Amino acid sequence: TSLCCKQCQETEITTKNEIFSLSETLTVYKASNLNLIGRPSTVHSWFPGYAWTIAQCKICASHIGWKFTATKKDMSPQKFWGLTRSALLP
Amino acid sequence: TSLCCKQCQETEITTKNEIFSLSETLTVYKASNLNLIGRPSTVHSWFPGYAWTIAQCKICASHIGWKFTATKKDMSPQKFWGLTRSALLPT
Amino acid sequence: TSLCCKQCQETEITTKNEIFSLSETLTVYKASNLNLIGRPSTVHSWFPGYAWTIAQCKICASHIGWKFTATKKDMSPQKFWGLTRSALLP
Numbered sequence: 001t002s003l004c005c006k007q008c009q010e011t012e013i014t015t016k017n018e019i020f021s022l023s024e025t026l027t028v029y030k031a032s033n034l035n036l037i038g039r040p041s042t043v044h045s046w047f048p049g050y051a052w053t054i055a056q057c058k059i060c061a062s063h064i065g066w067k068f069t070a071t072k073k074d075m076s077p078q079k080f081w082g083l084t085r086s087a088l089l090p
Numbered sequence: 091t092s093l094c095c096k097q098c099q100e101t102e103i104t105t106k107n108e109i110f111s112l113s114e115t116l117t118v119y120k121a122s123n124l125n126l127i128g129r130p131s132t133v134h135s136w137f138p139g140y141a142w143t144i145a146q147c148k149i150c151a152s153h154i155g156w157k158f159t160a161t162k163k164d165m166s167p168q169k170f171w172g173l174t175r176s177a178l179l180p181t
Numbered sequence: 182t183s184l185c186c187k188q189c190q191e192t193e194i195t196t197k198n199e200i201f202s203l204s205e206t207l208t209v210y211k212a213s214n215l216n217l218i219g220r221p222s223t224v225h226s227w228f229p230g231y232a233w234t235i236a237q238c239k240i241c242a243s244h245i246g247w248k249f250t251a252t253k254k255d256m257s258p259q260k261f262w263g264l265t266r267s268a269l270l271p
């Protein structure tokens with residue numbers, strides 16, 4: 001089930017069990033081993049109602065995707081990860 | 091694994107991966123594409139120690155279930171979803 | 182998929198769907214029916230950057246594992262559980 005950082009190979013980022021459908025970019029409820037770079041922005045957000053924060057592998061700093069955070073409290077999930085599929089192995 | 095709103099058929103509300111057993115009403119750790127109506131209440135809560143908030147499909151406003159939030163910090167999960175099985179497709 | 186408290190048998194603590202790899206002790210994103218005892222500590226933490234809180238079964242008080250809580254905001258997950266495998270069935 002593991003989806004690992006493609007660059008450093010060994011580092012698990014998420015699992016297929018975390019995949020969900022909100023409507024290239026995999027959306028998952030939970031992820032691991034990522035560092036958040038900077039502050040959320042809503043500029044060009046692919047998911048209306050959410051802001052994005054760059055997320056990179058904590059081991060090799062590969063840009064894997066973004067943490068998406070809801071701007072309104074009545075939305076669900078309040079946060080998820082949108083991950084570039086080609087930056088993950090399997 | 092997708093569990094969709096029975097009414098609008100398009101909208102995924104949770105997945106079989108998210109099901110867990112707290113103890114008609116499916117309980118899941120995580121859900122999607124729900125709007126929360128109102129503020130939490132504990133009155134007649136089906137899960138003692140948790141407050142509920144009505145949760146409806148964001149597309150068709152069909153009442154799918156409730157978001158349950160823990161009233162005490164030492165409980166696990168601190169939040170979950172109780173979904174009406176008859177309001178979702180697959181079974 | 183259910184992993185139940187071995188002692189009281191009937192209480193589910195987590196499911197295989199919740200297992201992930203942060204790298205005897207199973208790590209899962211989500212768990213249920215556990216009571217937390219005391220306050221977080223980083224003393225001897227098995228997971229640098231996380232503090233631990235003892236977690237016991239809400240029904241039989243068997244010690245199942247620990248809740249791990251991030252000491253910094255930019256970590257993912259912000260929390261998880263580490264559960265003693267021999268304290269669970271399947």
Ligand SMILES: Nc1cccc2c1C(=O)N([C@H]1CCC(=O)NC1=O)C2=O
Nearest residue numbers: 043044045046047051052053066082
């Ligand atoms: N490569 C660049 C370069 C400039 C601006 C953006 C990107 C980029 O990937 N995104 C994403 C961030 C994530 C998102 O939701 N929408 C975007 O357009 C930008 O805003």
Ligand SMILES: Nc1cccc2c1C(=O)N([C@H]1CCC(=O)NC1=O)C2=O
Nearest residue numbers: 133134135136137141142143156172
């Ligand atoms: N249809 C009605 C009408 C009045 C009050 C409630 C309901 C209802 O479904 N619940 C639920 C909310 C969720 C819960 O935990 N227990 C309930 O009885 C009510 O409190």
Ligand SMILES: Nc1cccc2c1C(=O)N([C@H]1CCC(=O)NC1=O)C2=O
Nearest residue numbers: 223224225226227228232233234247
């Ligand atoms: N049985 C004892 C006795 C004293 C201290 C600890 C333990 C114990 O199991 N842990 C764990 C807590 C969880 C952890 O992260 N590291 C540990 O060493 C202790 O700190």
Ligand SMILES: [Zn+2]
Nearest residue numbers: 005008057060
């Ligand atoms: Zn990496």
Ligand SMILES: [Zn+2]
Nearest residue numbers: 095098147150
């Ligand atoms: Zn709907």
Ligand SMILES: [Zn+2]
Nearest residue numbers: 186189238241
């Ligand atoms: Zn037990």
